Write a protein that binds this DNA or RNA. Structure first.
Ligand code: DCP
Ligand code: CA
Ligand code: CA
Length: 343
DNA sequence: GGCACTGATCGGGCCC
DNA sequence: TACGCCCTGATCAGTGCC
């Protein structure tokens, strides 16, 4: 198998540069503002100029503004980045036997037949793909070329930005012989530090570690994964991916326990959730983030589909029950998720 | 015990 | 210190049932 992983450098920020080229070459920060205050919100992404100054994704806006006061701080415009993504994935689809859009930001392309098994022509094709995306969309990306999904991802993320990582089948075993656990996709930090500390620094340290004592720490799934992965027996095929849930989340104007206050926001969240869902959900979940950013959720799955008018009533009840089991804390953010969807 | 099903938690930008 | 919006599957806990 010959897999080409595609990963769009500093995506949101870079789209903001394509739309406003005055922003290029200077620190730019793409923020999600909640509307509580002028600065309340979070860093979605930043160009590398801003990252040099210490701006990191996930960080509060005000905190980025401490270390990078002169950066350009722009609000996130997800619909546009979505459109950009769509067009780019469409470009990719024409090159692959199969494409797996892992998300708005990245995708895997099985090019095996396309390049007729010739891995080198696979690399060349990857160059053509980078070139084409650059020509048409003015977006730079990083590419991984490898004999599987995971390796392609790993060599990609090790090559950012604007990179072209390659792991020829010749080199695979050597790459696995010297690969840290924290460098594996799907292994946490809570999980990484355990393995790392409690014996298993690198991947090969799994081939010789009584399977069970590993299964204790990771679980059956992850242990099986890491095992076949280390054994060079991971092969997972490229599969078209199907959305399983849609959620909409709102920051309330002010913290409160009063359902009567939260409800119109919860309804609003329900409305554009349903407005965007592609089917009927069998399960509705209410998500409430508390003052201290603790997350409570209460959901209900039905034997049938849930209409929107019904969702209002169900969700109100679920919310009322969340605030029966907490009794003390105020809600800061309200959210709703539609799951188990019938297309 | 073990099936079939519901339900809560979780991590990080996606993955098993 | 500071603090958004959004999405998976695994895993474990509970219930009812044969
Ligand atoms: N806390 C985060 C992290 C990431 N993203 C979004 C913005 C990123 O552009 C996109 C892609 O994730 P990446 O890990 O690949 O980060 P970059 O694109 O910015 O590089 O996901 C986000 O909204 N919030
Ligand atoms: Ca990515
Ligand atoms: Ca990216």
């Amino acid at each position: 198998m010959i897999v080409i992983f595609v990963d769009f450098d500093y995506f949101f920020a870079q789209v903001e540069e394509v739309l406003n080229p005055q922003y290029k070459g200077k620190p730019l920060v793409v923020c999600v503002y909640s509307g509580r205050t002028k600065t309340s919100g979070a860093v979605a992404t930043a160009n590398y100029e801003a990252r040099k100054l210490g701006v990191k994704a996930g960080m509060p806006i005000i905190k980025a503004m401490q270390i990078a006061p002169s950066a350009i701080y722009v609000p996130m415009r997800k619909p546009i980045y979505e459109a950009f993504s769509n067009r780019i994935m469409n470009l990719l689809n024409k090159h692959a036997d199969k494409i797996e859009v892992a998300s708005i930001d990245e995708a895997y392309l099985d090019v095996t037949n396309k390049v007729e098994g010739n891995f080198e022509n696979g690399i060349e094709l990857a160059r053509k793909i980078k070139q084409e995306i650059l020509e048409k969309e003015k977006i730079t990306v990083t590419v991984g070329v490898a004999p599987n999904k995971i390796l392609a991802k790993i060599i990609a993320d090790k090559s950012k930005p604007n990179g072209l990582g390659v792991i020829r089948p010749t080199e695979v075993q050597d790459f696995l012989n010297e690969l840290d656990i924290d460098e594996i996709p799907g292994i946490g930090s809570v999980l990484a530090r355990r393995l790392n500390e409690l014996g298993i620094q690198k991947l090969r340290d799994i081939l010789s570690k009584n399977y069970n004592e590993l299964e204790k720490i990771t679980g059956k799934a992850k242990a099986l994964y890491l095992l076949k992965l280390a054994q060079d027996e991971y092969n997972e095929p490229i599969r078209t991916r199907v959305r399983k849930s849609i959620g909409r989340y709102l920051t309330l104007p002010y913290n409160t326990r009063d359902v009567k206050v939260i409800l119109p926001y919860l309804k609003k969240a329900i409305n554009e959730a349903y407005n965007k869902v592609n089917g009927i959900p069998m399960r509705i979940t209410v998500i409430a983030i508390m003052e201290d950013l603790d997350i409570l959720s209460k959901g209900k799955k039905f034997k049938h589909g849930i209409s929107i008018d019904n969702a209002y009533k169900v969700a109100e009840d679920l919310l009322r029950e969340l605030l029966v089991r907490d009794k003390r804390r105020n809600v800061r953010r309200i959210g709703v998720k539609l799951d188990n969807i019938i297309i």
